Each structure stands twice: as structure tokens, then as C-alpha cells.
């Protein structure tokens, strides 16, 4: 009911957080790696 549905959008939004850093993250380690390989 009413108390499920507010716990799965709450998953569901977490989630969305969640990829979306360590997204960016995956990109800034592919990023540094290359600036660092310029030593």
C-alpha cells in the first residue's frame, strides 16, 4: 500500500543518485589517470 509505494520511489530515487555519482566519478578517474600519464 501507501507506505510500499513512498519505499520503492525512495529506492528508485537513491539509485538514481547513487549511478549518477559514481558515473561521474568513473569519468574523473578516466580523466585523471590521463592528466597523470602526462608527467
Known amino acids: 500500500g501507501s ?3 513512498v ?3 525512495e529506492l ?3 539509485f ?3 549511478i ?3 558515473r561521474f566519478l ?3 578517474n578516466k580523466i585523471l ?3 597523470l ?3
Open 3 to 5: 507506505n510500499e509505494k
Open 7 to 9: 519505499e520503492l520511489q
Open 12 to 14: 528508485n530515487d537513491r
Open 16 to 18: 538514481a543518485n547513487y
Open 20 to 22: 549518477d555519482k559514481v
Open 26 to 28: 568513473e569519468q574523473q
Open 33 to 35: 589517470l590521463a592528466e
Open 37 to 39: 600519464e602526462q608527467l
